[PDB]
Amino acid sequence: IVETLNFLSSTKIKERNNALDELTTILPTKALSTTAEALVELLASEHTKYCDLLRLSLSENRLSTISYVLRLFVEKSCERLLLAVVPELMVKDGSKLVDKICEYFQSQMKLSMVTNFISILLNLLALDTVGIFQVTRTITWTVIDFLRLSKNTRLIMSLINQLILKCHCFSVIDTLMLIKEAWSYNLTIGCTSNELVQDQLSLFDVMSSELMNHKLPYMIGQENYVEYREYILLRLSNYKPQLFTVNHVEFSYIRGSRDKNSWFAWLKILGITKSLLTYFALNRKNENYSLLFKRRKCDSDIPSILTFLIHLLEENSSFAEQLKELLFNGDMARLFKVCLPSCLLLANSIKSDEKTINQIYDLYELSNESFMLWGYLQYISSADRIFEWLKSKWNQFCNFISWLGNWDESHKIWQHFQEQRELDLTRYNEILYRLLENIDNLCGDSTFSEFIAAYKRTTLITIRTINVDHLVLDKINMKEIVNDFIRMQKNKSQTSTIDKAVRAYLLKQAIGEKSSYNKILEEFTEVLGEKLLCNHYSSSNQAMLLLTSYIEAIRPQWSDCNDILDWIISRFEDNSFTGVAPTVNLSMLLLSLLQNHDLSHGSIRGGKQRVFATFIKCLQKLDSSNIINIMNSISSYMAQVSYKNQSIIFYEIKSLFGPPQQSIEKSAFYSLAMSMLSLVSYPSLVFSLEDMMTYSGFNHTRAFIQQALNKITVAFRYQNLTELFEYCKFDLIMYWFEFLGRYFVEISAI
Amino acid sequence: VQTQFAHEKNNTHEFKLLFLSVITDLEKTSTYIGKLRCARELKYLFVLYENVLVKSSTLNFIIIRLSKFLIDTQIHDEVITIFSSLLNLADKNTFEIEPSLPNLFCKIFIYLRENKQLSPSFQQA
């Protein structure tokens, strides 16, 4: 049946899914296996074919060999709910659940081979920011940096997500979760990279693009260079201090950046600032073959003299900023430089009329806010004249503002405004913004005139081919900034424009919305699974939002029936299988609802349901804790239950180091009456060393002073310890941070 | 209520020690946090319950020491205490004086300003 399987794979027949549709039915035997594997438009057979070629240990080896490389790996690169759990188990076997198997593959990889995919995996790790083993998620650095220097910008760029925080010693147990969240959030790497590239052009000029990640990876490792897995730890640490990966390739790559540095170079005199003073810095490091960062290299070079960018990078270690952020006769001399130039940056840093005019005239010929405002900061009649000329020459954003920052200006504006009043619509929108920016007899007159002019100018701006598209002749451009709100709504609705939808629903609105929600729900029920996983989470998250929205509607209408609708949805959604990490919000919604109200125990049940939810620990607990704390309601029964739940999370010791962080948070849980004792008890439960002493320092700092110096609670906590076998002459020594304990707890002992 | 039951055995009960306890509480929640302040708020009500002794025009510090940040874990408490105090200042001899008023006004006018939500219980007091 091989001929049939080949024909079934054969792409082209309805978007090449025809191969996938045939596969769904298939799911001669070897041929059938290839046909079922086609589920991937067809290219998901080669692995089946490898097994077929073997036609039984060899068939398994062949399929596995091919899975690694036969065709496209149908969500196999990083597996992208029981089927997925099985895939994770298979992954552990393949390395020879998900997190677990991670520790098997990383290890295997560290010990042998495993570049863009590896860098992407490094980025995936950054997005992970933890691991169900850690080592399997840390000890990869060996083979890592190995094949690394062993041997485009994008691979280095992917490596950067991990490199950015390639350091140890700090807010642990939570730092990993935070790293994961940030690195995953940046995961949207793409259009955003293009935006950063656009910002780079705005920023000044360096090189291609897709190199910001490439330089960021290097900058972070360079910071490290400038600076029992612990022994080998410090060992390889000093190594990377002078050993990492690919130093020749990077040196060549750096030339683009070096060119940018050369471009960056009275300021004009500095163009030849000691020829290659920078070379001295490089030589100091290269000669050291180890150096002493801090600035020793800088010291070798340097060229100070009577900079902004300097202090900038200094602290770092607006376009440029946003890039990294996202990732993670003097008057005449100046005017001449300004006329040539940019000028705005120098003028802005500095925060004579004819001199100003020479530069303003050059700016006028060039004809924005940066120059206009930088000039305003000096508040030049001659330059004002050039500014009027600038309007004539022009024949972003701001313009009039500088006027506000600093009656000829009004007249020039009036003339320009008149010209604008005379797509005209685009000019009119800019004029309206400019008028606000500069916010005066002319202005009053203009307010009236502008209302008429704007109405007249607007026409010039002029679903898929109708309800939205009809507006697009204008809106495609008119909406591209449109301070108002309407295009964002169209873009979002797909998943004034808003006003019309609002009007369509317009407590009465809740009833209209309920009917609409029911229709959407019916469609969702019919879809019941499909996205192949995306639908799952999407459903879990949507369900959380929808049930929450229905409850919110009751609150706004108040009505209550909407909360009942939320409950019905929640009940349907209680079937479990909460969407992968998608149900996280749901559990969160359930917890929020439990806090918000319940008047029927349901809150207690919701809390239990959330308590039973999964996750690589950390995070959710913290959020919930904070939320609950932000609650008073005098009593003494719920708090006790909450304390008991928190305590349940005190066992196992060892990783107490994580518990110490939790304890600082527990103490900094508004503490108040009683609970201080509970926070103290939590601390008593574990000892990753003076961990408590540090946790107490942090909690105390939140409440002033630190640890023992901020004990106070000791008046009772020492008694709690006094009550203990060892007593206060064995525990309070740590609390005091022994004879110290015997003294610290003497009254407690009595 | 065991602490209360033990406290109930008020052998040699007097009056003046109340003062110490009140000033102790004022310091404790002048700092720390809202949860502590909430704990103290409950304690303040208990102190008032405990304050069986009274001396009309000689007490004075019926309010005064009550002129605390009536916000967060205090707005309701201050109101409860102030309202309760207002009842006390009406009850029996009443002994509704006034040489504390300037400060009461400072707190009233700001806390009833801010978000401008005074509540009718204020006006009734």
Residue numbers in the entry:
A (entry chain A): 6 to 32, 40 to 67, 77 to 101, 109 to 124, 159 to 176, 181 to 217, 222 to 297, 308 to 345, ...
B (entry chain A): 1270 to 1394
Mind quoting what the paper says about this structure?
ATM/Tel1 belongs to the evolutionarily conserved phosphatidylinositol-3-kinase-related protein kinase (PIKK) family. In budding yeast, Tel1 and Mec1 correspond to ATM and ATR, respectively. ATM primarily responds to DNA double-strand breaks (DSBs), whereas ATR is activated by DSBs as well as various types of DNA replication stress. Under normal cellular conditions, ATM is inactive and exists in a homodimeric form.
Besides the 4.1 Å cryo-EM structure of symmetric dimer, we also determined a 4.3 Å structure of asymmetric dimer of Tel1/ATM, which allows to trace the course of the polypeptide. We next compared the Tel1 structures of the Compact and Butterfly conformers. In the Compact Tel1, the FAT and kinase N-lobe move down by ~5–8 Å, whereas the Spiral of α-solenoid moves upwards by ~11 Å relative to their positions in the Butterfly conformer. The overall height has been reduced from 190 Å (Butterfly) to 175 Å (Compact). The kα11 and kα12 (FATC) are partially disordered, while the α4 (TRD2), α15 (TRD3) and kα9b (PRD) are almost fully disordered in the Compact conformer. As the PRD and FATC become disordered, their inhibition on the activation loop is at least partially relieved, which can now move outside of the substrate-binding groove by ~6 Å. However, the disordered fragments in the Compact monomer release these constraints, leaving sufficient space for a peptide substrate to bind. The activation loop could move outside of the substrate-binding groove to access substrates in the Compact conformer.
